[PDB]
Amino acid sequence: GIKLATGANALDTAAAIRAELAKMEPFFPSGLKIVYPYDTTPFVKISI
Amino acid sequence: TDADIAQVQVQNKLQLAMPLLPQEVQQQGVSVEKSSSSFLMVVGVINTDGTMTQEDISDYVAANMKDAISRTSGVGDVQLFGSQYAMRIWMNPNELNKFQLTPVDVITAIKAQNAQVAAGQLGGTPPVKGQQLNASIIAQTRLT
Amino acid sequence: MPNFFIDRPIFAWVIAIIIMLAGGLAILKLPVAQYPTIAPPAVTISASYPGADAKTVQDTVTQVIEQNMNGIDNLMYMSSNSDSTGTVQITLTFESGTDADIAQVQVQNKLQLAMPLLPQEVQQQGVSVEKSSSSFLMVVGVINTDGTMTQEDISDYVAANMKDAISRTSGVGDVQLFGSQYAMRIWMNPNELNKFQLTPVDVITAIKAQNAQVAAGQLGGTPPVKGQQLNASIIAQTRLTSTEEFGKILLKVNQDGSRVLLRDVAKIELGGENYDIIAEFNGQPASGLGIKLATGANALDTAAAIRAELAKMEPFFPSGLKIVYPYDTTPFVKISIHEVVKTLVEAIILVFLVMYLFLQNFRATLIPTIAVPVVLLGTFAVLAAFGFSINTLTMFGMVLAIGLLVDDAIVVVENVERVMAEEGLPPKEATRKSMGQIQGALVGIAMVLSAVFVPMAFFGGSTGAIYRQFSITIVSAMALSVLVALILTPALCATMLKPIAKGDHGEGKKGFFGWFNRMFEKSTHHYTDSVGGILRSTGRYLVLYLIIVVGMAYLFVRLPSSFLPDEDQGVFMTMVQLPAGATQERTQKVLNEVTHYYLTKEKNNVESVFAVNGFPFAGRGQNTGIAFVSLKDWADRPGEENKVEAITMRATRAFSQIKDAMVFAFNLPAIVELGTATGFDFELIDQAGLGHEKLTQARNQLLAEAAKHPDMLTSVRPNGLEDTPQFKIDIDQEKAQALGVSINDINTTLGAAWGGSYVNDFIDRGRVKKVYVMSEAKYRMLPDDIGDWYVRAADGQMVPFSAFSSSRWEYGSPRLERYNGLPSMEILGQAAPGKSTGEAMELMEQLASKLPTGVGYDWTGMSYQERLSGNQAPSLYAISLIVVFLCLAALYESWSIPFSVMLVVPLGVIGALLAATFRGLTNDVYFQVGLLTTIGLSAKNAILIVEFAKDLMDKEGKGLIEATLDAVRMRLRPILMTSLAFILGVMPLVISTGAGSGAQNAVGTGVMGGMVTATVLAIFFVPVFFVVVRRRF
Amino acid sequence: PGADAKTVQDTVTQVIEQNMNGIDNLMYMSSNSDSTGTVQITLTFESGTDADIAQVQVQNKLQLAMPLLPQEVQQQGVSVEKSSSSFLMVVGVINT
Amino acid sequence: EDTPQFKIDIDQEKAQALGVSINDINTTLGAAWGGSYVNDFIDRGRVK
Amino acid sequence: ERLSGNQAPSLYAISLIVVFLCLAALYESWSIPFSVMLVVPLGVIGAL
Amino acid sequence: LGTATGFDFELIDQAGLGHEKLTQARNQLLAEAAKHPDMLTSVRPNGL
Amino acid sequence: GSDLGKKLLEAARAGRDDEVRILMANGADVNAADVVGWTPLHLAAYWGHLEIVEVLLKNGADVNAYDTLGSTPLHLAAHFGHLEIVEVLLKNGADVNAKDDNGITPLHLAANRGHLEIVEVLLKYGADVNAQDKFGKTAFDISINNGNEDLAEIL
């Protein structure tokens, strides 16, 4: 459950989080998968 | 209000109250954060093979993913929707009373036998004239 | 605007006076430094666990602190290392442009909350949070010559009588003591302890109880009994002050009546806190003071104040104490400023001689002698407003811009002198006509030049910070030069210039000047006859131009790349690495031979040798040591053979004979926080909890695979230490419980005697110092001495260590590295000759994909910044060309004509590359910025030719060849004058041999060679570019 | 607590004062050492200085002196606050 | 101004001979003559 | 108070120069500002 | 910012009455708020 | 020491088979030991370099070489589960009942680490199952303290 820092950009932080998750993915155990059940940033990206 | 300065002011006052707080609270870790009230996003982690249980996934997420995400700029707070593994010692009061032992003896033996000891060195400084051996001494280490 | 200031010369003078006053005020209040803040903000958390191994420090201190480094803004990466000397260094590097005070306070606050999670020994020692900077203003050495003080005695005197006064000196930001102040050392004896049934635990218990501050209270304190007349504070037990008081500490009283004191079981003396470092300066004991320059402080003023403060302490120094200066950046800064000021004054003198050779009147020669210093002074006022500092980068930025500053003054004055000689107009009316011909061109030139240097400031990282210094300095000087040429110069030309008759071209004069005018007018006609013939066969010169473009493209690849040229700063390093497991005494034998080499074979060049045994570099163990060689002045070391590069290669070759010791010498970089060019900083991360031994095998696999490609990778070496043999001692819990020996008592006896235990504080001569309990050297060297330690059991019996312990030899790391919270192995290397850095990194990534499962990788430091700097490079070059084209399209009112000007770029670069290739110089930042000032000045000359040729076709209705031949004839004299003074102005920089010549040669050669071709080629190629472009379109 | 003015100055005041070097826009620094155990080091900065940034810079320099201070002083806690010498007002409370 | 102060010298040899702990001497002197802060309590809903 | 008095002469010196230069630029002359600046002592005598 | 018609009230204990007394005052207020459905709707505590 | 002798210690520790082979041809000292008393065979048995152990034993290396603490290469091969090296060393005359300065046999080290295959080879070569260390602990006493059910059946 990621909480955005005070004054930080929502889209820039979400992009940085996804870039960090990408570095972990090649070293995941058998069957491990990242899903996104809650994300407020795709709405900002699409509506704009 | 500059959130960086607001956190520094709150932290400065907390440092004064920290020694007054119980030792159990201090060892747990007091945190000061400048995060928003709502969740920016929730990064779910599942196992499509079924190899790992809910507890196993929660441990992997905390031990290999949480710390790096918490250090990411713009991330005020990270809430682990589970728990990192911990060496659980599940006491039995029937077995403890059988051998005349208490939870206090268990804590004492765990503190004494699960310890990372600074043993020193062989031929350490200031050394003698004519010393040829220099090696670190390795005493008890944290149990794995 | 020029017409407004032609009629109003006093207004123009008032503007120039204000610019001079603002520039003069800025010169006095501008901070002077060697180099500005270039490296990104880095914060280093340093902690100490006395007597602990690398794994103990990592698993109890490093991991805990790393786990709590969360919620900190603008963090890029976090490297850390735990070594066998009980030391951890957690460096957090932040994004460039982050408030370093905020970054440090955010790291410090997170460490304060993580503090209750660290061991009691680490909390007692304390953890310090500092700003990572190897940029010392100077290193002040304190030596003993009469052999009365040891290295610990000197360090104590400095800490209590010098450090505080040096810290309070004007402009001193930080003082680092290279040594340890006194510490009450309790050298325990196990034979004496066992005799009276005592253990190191009893020693610690007695010192803690008998050496402590006790709160007692008050006599007649509130609430008092009504009628109290006396109120006094009560003092009960204070901290001990002398060794005699520590020796008199009562441990126990025998049954017969005799007392057991601390002096009976231990040797009490005032020693040092840390004995791991042996510092020597020319064979005699020494201590140091790492002084750093404060933010916004003057380096030349601070160094003078430090020496003045040291002179005040001179009559108070003990017998034999001497102050030496092994490292000082101040003489380098003093020369870096003086050589710039010398070149700026020489340029004015040369411009005076060039103006008087052609124009031949003292009234004209005074105009650039006024305009140039006004522009130069004004640049300092803009630098002060932009928060900049007087440093090597900003000082050489003005030297590179001197060609643009003198050109603006020459272009205006010459045009007025030409209009007066061709029409006979009075100085005021001729200035209005002359300014009308070049005012639009000067404004257009300012826009084109802005489009060349402004995008250079938008680079990122350390490279971007270096380019920013040159961009702002050159853009500010160029903008003020155009402002002065449009405001001050037209006023000076209309009021100071002498009238010239129509037709008077100076040919009617007598003497040398009369001959020079007749020779120059004949050469001017010969120039037009040559240009006319060149315009008949333009096709031949188009092919000849393509040969120049091909030659430029070839020489660009065949030029070695670099950031800053390595200069003879006067000092160099010498690394001494003995085999894994060598003692401190064995490292001193090698250091003495290294010191003997510099004081015998190189005694004519070497001034002093700072042999620091156990230096923090390479795990700061007993098997490492450095030799900081300080040389004599550059005047006392003439020739290439007496320079750092030659001395280093001779020393490395001589030290190869020293067997069982890896001794090699190397020069220090221009900027310590840059490392090397064409080199990489790789990190081998453990992303699956594989372990240390598994990560070592993976590193060896990658290292062997890198060796299989010598054509792309060279010098791929790990930046860490190999596993060493360690003494694993196992305490049997069964035997310890059977005998009645406490486990804590065993670990305390083993830890305090073999590693040293920090008990508490004491007061030595009004100074708070540490108290350490440790075994005497005689009883803690070999595994046999383990069994000589007896621990008292609950029944009172003394049980030796050999009864409850078994020991074996095993391998373990003396330095564990961790990158971004995960275990890592840092790997250094560089690209092979001919291959780019991007090619070497790409191969490293390909070889990393073949490593075992769980072994990851990442780029750190210079590699991390080179990844993001290379992405911005194509866009910044493209924006420069687009804006340059657009500025010319608006000036000329054409979409095709701007191409004639843009074709002069390779004309100035071909000479710069030829001058650097024939000399042996590299493509450094001075050469890259010097290339832009050559391109800019050649385009400045081409703009004035194309503008004159177009206006002759548009207004006078002349033909293409007719107007082109007239334009080159008019612009021949101002082009020949600027080049003659600029080439002679940068001539002393090329021939600079001594002090700070590494930067002067890069600035000088890259400009002199470039200007020679950008003058000889442009005068014949520019008319071709204009004719070919206008015929094509 | 319980330490006299001489011990308080030698073990606490001097240690913090020697680390307050090179702070931006520093005018002067006055410090008191009470016989009770109180230490009060006031650092006055030039007019126009960001008082918040000044507090941050002082707090960073205090971190270097914190390890050398006694454990009894660290148990009380060291505070770094922005200071003013005079009272805006005094609000008295009486019981009629 | 300089104020007079009461200096007490605890004899370590005499205290150890009688069996009196130095920690108990320092606690007895400090708690009685200066006042010792033992712990906290709740006075009408507020920790004191 | 000490700083106020030390900067005082430098304050009057730059103010006189700025006014003089402003008058020279506005009225395009050297005699005009110089004759106007001679009136400063006539005012300062009354202020004192 | 809110939910347009929602309000956030805070019942404070300013006399050391205790938790049991504060609960009784909250219940009294909640009963009186229910008696006015024409103005106050969904008035409930945000605690356990 | 020697220039080639110290190079052999680094080659046997890293596992450079080609460097060891060239050093054998040039006459590098096989009985060269470091500060702690470890010969190239000790380092090869500790780091698990099977081919290097065979090359060293072929060039007359002391199979029963003991360090400053009485530990032999068989102790290191059995303690770190290098089954192939344990058999190679035992074939070349390694003392199966070798006791270090603590009275610990290679069987005690293999039993503590739980190496069933190594314990079986050791017992086959005649390892004393009733061997006691300095504390009187046999390999069976170690197996029951660790909780190795499979190892307790063998012992």
Ligand SMILES: CO[C@H]1/C=C/O[C@@]2(C)Oc3c(C)c(O)c4c(O)c(c(C=O)c(O)c4c3C2=O)NC(=O)/C(C)=C\C=C\[C@H](C)[C@H](O)[C@@H](C)[C@@H](O)[C@@H](C)[C@H](OC(C)=O)[C@@H]1C
């Ligand atoms: C260009 O860089 C050079 C000098 C910079 O100038 C200085 C002033 O700036 C330094 C910085 C920015 C470091 O990070 C250093 C470093 O990490 C070192 C050592 C020393 O030891 C150093 O000496 C420095 C060092 C400097 O003197 N390595 C270590 O601590 C560790 C834990 C292991 C080292 C292992 C070997 C022995 C080492 O890898 C060796 C093979 C070389 O690669 C280096 C000595 C480089 O020499 C060369 C000539 O290539 C330097 C990094």
Ligand SMILES: CCCCCCCCCCCCCCCCCCCC(=O)O[C@H](COC(=O)CCCCCCCCCCCCCC)COP(=O)(O)OCCN
């Ligand atoms: C804190 C420390 C600060 C240190 C610096 C102090 C600041 C300096 C203050 C400014 C000083 C300027 C002095 C200028 C004097 C010029 C000579 C004056 C002669 C004069 O009065 O003739 C005027 C015009 O002169 C003319 O017609 C010819 C004059 C030509 C223009 C001026 C050229 C000389 C200026 C050189 C300045 C160099 C300054 C160096 C710092 C009057 O004639 P009118 O206009 O009343 O006519 C009326 C009919 N129409």
Ligand SMILES: CCCCCCCCCCCCO[C@@H]1O[C@H](CO)[C@@H](O[C@H]2O[C@H](CO)[C@@H](O)[C@H](O)[C@H]2O)[C@H](O)[C@H]1O
């Ligand atoms: C006129 C137009 C052209 C302008 C070019 C000239 C200005 C360029 C230099 C910038 C000013 C240099 O900065 C100024 O120099 C003086 C020396 O003269 C320095 O003065 C310092 O230098 C030396 C260093 O050993 C000391 O002996 C001296 O005690 C110390 O104060 C100061 O650090 C600074 O006040």
Ligand SMILES: CCCCCCCCCCCCO[C@@H]1O[C@H](CO)[C@@H](O[C@H]2O[C@H](CO)[C@@H](O)[C@H](O)[C@H]2O)[C@H](O)[C@H]1O
């Ligand atoms: C290594 C030695 C190099 C020699 C010097 C080269 C310097 C480079 C600067 C360019 C000088 C060009 O010099 C100039 O060339 C042109 C050729 O187009 C000559 O022009 C002459 O030959 C050309 C070609 O046959 C005719 O079209 C033209 O009618 C005729 O006048 C000029 O008479 C000469 O002055």
Ligand SMILES: CCCCCCCCCC[N+](C)(C)[O-]
């Ligand atoms: C030196 C301070 C700025 C001076 C400004 C004065 C400008 C007045 C110009 C008046 N005029 C255009 C008529 O000459």
Ligand SMILES: CCCCCCCCCCCC
């Ligand atoms: C009378 C026409 C004069 C032409 C003025 C052109 C000014 C050039 C500036 C180009 C930058 C946008």
Ligand SMILES: CCCCCCCC
């Ligand atoms: C009519 C144009 C006047 C320009 C004045 C410039 C002042 C800096």
Ligand SMILES: CCCCCC
């Ligand atoms: C386009 C500007 C480039 C500057 C030199 C790298």
